[PDB]
Amino acid sequence: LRKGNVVVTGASSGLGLATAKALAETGKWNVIMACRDFLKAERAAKSVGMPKDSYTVMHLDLASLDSVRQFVDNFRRTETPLDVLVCNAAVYFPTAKEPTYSAEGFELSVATNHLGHFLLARLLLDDLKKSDYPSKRLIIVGSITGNTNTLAGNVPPKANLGDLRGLAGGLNGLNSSAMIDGGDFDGAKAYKDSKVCNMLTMQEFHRRFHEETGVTFASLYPGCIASTGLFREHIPLFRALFPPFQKYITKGYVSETESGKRLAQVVSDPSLTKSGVYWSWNNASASFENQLSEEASDVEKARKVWEISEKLVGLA
């Protein structure tokens, strides 16, 4: 079988670097690392010892739609088939009193996590359909805290998308609120809302394109990878205390290598061919279909998100 091509976002840092390492040590994949920092992506690829032939770094800054369209035109210029697209990029700002916004004016957490991935996926889907590979998949990462069923979701600050009032406003923050619900700005709630938007995006993609094409859509929660850089902006005391807290008190700590092997299994396991599944892993390395929260599963809300995002990015 032809070595398959995998476009993986945010490969510079832990999760994507591990996934690329796992999918390149096999020798059966060509990985394309789409990252904002080109130099940070070379040092990681060399450090992790991925073969030179297998990787091919390319630029992609999700916060800027122009960067996305440029990446797309270059990727179509390479005249290479596209098989699997992984959306794993994210920026988290726990302790911001004043928000930072992206190029088109959107709050930075929601543009990087959802809108950019939303545009990239829809643009590259046309390339995915015209691919002769046996299995085509589109992987979207998610977090357990997005769902409120679990204790992690029920922490004092939690996610909410009550009326998509902010998204309709355009998230500019002018004569409006950056938060989708419309409440006071909170660093965590925006990230959680973006994760929920990603889950709804997966559901809607399954509903609209699964029968038409045959492109598997999936989402997964790897675990609490406390060693990565997502908490870089957090205070040091947190960074230090959190990993032991997860290891011993909550027992949800997962090693980086385990998370990479899990995501790669999602990418390349024949068994996991059911679309529209919020995957999850057990303590014994067992893959199961976890259950989403009520709001996350709402059809109308997801439709409302789909149309609003489509208008905002200029797809209309």
Ligand X SMILES: NC(=O)C1=CN([C@@H]2O[C@H](COP(=O)(O)OP(=O)(O)OC[C@H]3O[C@@H](n4cnc5c(N)ncnc54)[C@H](OP(=O)(O)O)[C@@H]3O)[C@@H](O)[C@H]2O)C=CC1
Select which of 92, 191, 221, 253 is catalytic: 191
> What distances in angstroms separate CA 202 from CA 118, 121, 172, one per listed residue?
10, 10, 25
Residues in the chain: 316
Amino acid at 223: G
Choose among 74, 70, 73, 84: nearest CA to 137: 84
* Size of residue set near ligand X by CB under 6 A: 29
Minimum distance of ligand X from residue 228's CB (angstroms): 4
Minimum distance of ligand PMR from residue 143's CB (angstroms): 5
String of contacts with ligand X for each residue 88-127, x by CB under 6 A: xxxx--------------------x---------------
Does position 122 interact with a copy of itself (CB under 8 A)? The reply is no
101 is known as an active-site residue? no
Could you tell me whether strands 29-35 and 4-9 are parallel, antiparallel, or unpaired per DSSP bridges?
parallel
Count Cβ atoms within 10 A of the Cβ of residue 105 and give its class: 0-12 exposed, 13-18 middle, 19 or more buried.
Answer: middle
130's tokens: 């015209």
String of contacts with ligand X for each residue 142-181, x by CB under 6 A: -x--------------------------------------
Q: Which residues pair with 31 in a beta bridge?
A: 6, 55
Question: From a copy of itself, ligand PMR, ligand X, none, which one binds at residue 22 (CB under 5 to 8 Å depending on kind)?
Answer: none
* H or E element in which residue 307 lies: helix 299-312
Choose among 241, 206, 275: nearest CA to 266: 275
- Contacts of 244 by beta carbon, 8 Å cutoff, 6+ apart: none
Minimum distance of a copy of itself from residue 266's CB (angstroms): 17
Could you tell me whether strands 58-59 and 137-141 are parallel, antiparallel, or unpaired per DSSP bridges?
unpaired
Nearer to ligand X, 23 or 35 (CB): 35
Minimum distance of ligand PMR from residue 258's CB (angstroms): 14
Question: From ligand X, a copy of itself, ligand PMR, none, which one binds at residue 89 (CB under 5 to 8 Å depending on kind)?
Answer: ligand X
Binding to a copy of itself in span 52-91, by CB under 8 A: 57-59, 61, 63-64, 66-67, 70, 73-74, 77
- The values of phi and psi at residue 135, to 5°, are -120, 120
Which residue from 3, 26, 39, 269 is in contact with a copy of itself, where contact means CB under 8 A? 39
CA 236/CA 11 separation, integer angstroms: 24
Nearer to ligand PMR, 92 or 106 (CB): 92
String of contacts with ligand X for each residue 224-263, x by CB under 6 A: xx--xxx---------------------------------
Catalytic residues: 191
